[PDB]
Design a protein around this ligand. Structure first.
Ligand code: NI
Length: 241
């Protein structure tokens, strides 16, 4: 029945993070995902993620034993995409920011957090208006998420390109970005605040006649000073690149 070790199987299924990296390399480009089918292929692998796949099995146990500093682990950065993990202790915050021209696939690896996200009410006015003045945005998501929760996707103008996170328990957010942030290519991680201007309307009529209700007015701004985030080495299974 068995060869007693003489004939091992070999060419085994690459372990999770290797499989995931391999698929990103084939599914992603400097222009973003190659296709929705291609992006779905990355999404199908990412959904199965476990804390042990990325060396976070110990931190995941802090969830059961339930501003503060956030740890950021960079697993890969190339012109085509980046992979990173935010390890957030309870009560920490990733302040409101956007992902210009970018698609981001994200997965809560463990724990619970709150996400609030918006999109501009008039995406076509991005290149024609001053980002330092108040601009109308529509609410997309405003909800707690608790692992296991399906992977989420934001696009350059839909799915909540402007978002913020607040950790409820210890949690880790696994992010795949294509294209990656690049201050050189005009793709900066810009932060935003609610406009303190008084007389801004709650609803508007935009191009077509569509009435956008519950508008939120956002000003570009420097990130808050209590946002402490430290770069930390990835200590999980190695990626063969
Ligand atoms: Ni983000």
């Amino acid at each position: 029945h068995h060869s007693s070790g003489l004939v091992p199987r070999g060419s085994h299924m690459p372990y999770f993070i290797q499989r995931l990296f391999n698929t990103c390399k084939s599914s992603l480009s400097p222009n973003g995902p190659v296709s929705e089918e291609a992006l779905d292929k990355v999404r199908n692998v990412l959904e199965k993620i476990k804390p042990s796949d990325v060396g976070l099995e110990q931190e995941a146990q802090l969830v059961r034993n339930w501003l503060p500093a956030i740890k950021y682990l960079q697993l890969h950065e190339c012109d085509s995409f980046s992979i990173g993990i935010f390890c957030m202790p309870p009560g920490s915050i990733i302040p409101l920011h956007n992902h210009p021209g970018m698609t981001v696939l994200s997965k809560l690896v463990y724990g619970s957090m709150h996400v609030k996200s918006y999109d501009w009410a008039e995406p076509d006015q991005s290149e024609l208006d001053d980002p330092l003045q108040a601009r109308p945005a529509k609410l997309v998501k405003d909800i707690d998420m608790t692992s296991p929760s399906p992977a989420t996707t934001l696009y350059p103008t839909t799915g909540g390109n402007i978002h913020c996170f607040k950790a409820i328990t210890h949690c880790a957010i696994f992010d795949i970005l294509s294209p990656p942030y690049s201050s050189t290519h005009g793709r900066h991680c810009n932060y935003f605040r609610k406009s303190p201007m008084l007389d801004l309307p709650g609803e508007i009529e935009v191009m077509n006649g569509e009435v956008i209700s519950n508008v939120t007015w956002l000003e570009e701004y420097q990130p808050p000073d209590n946002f402490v985030i430290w770069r930390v080495p990835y200590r999980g299974p190695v990626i063969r690149k």
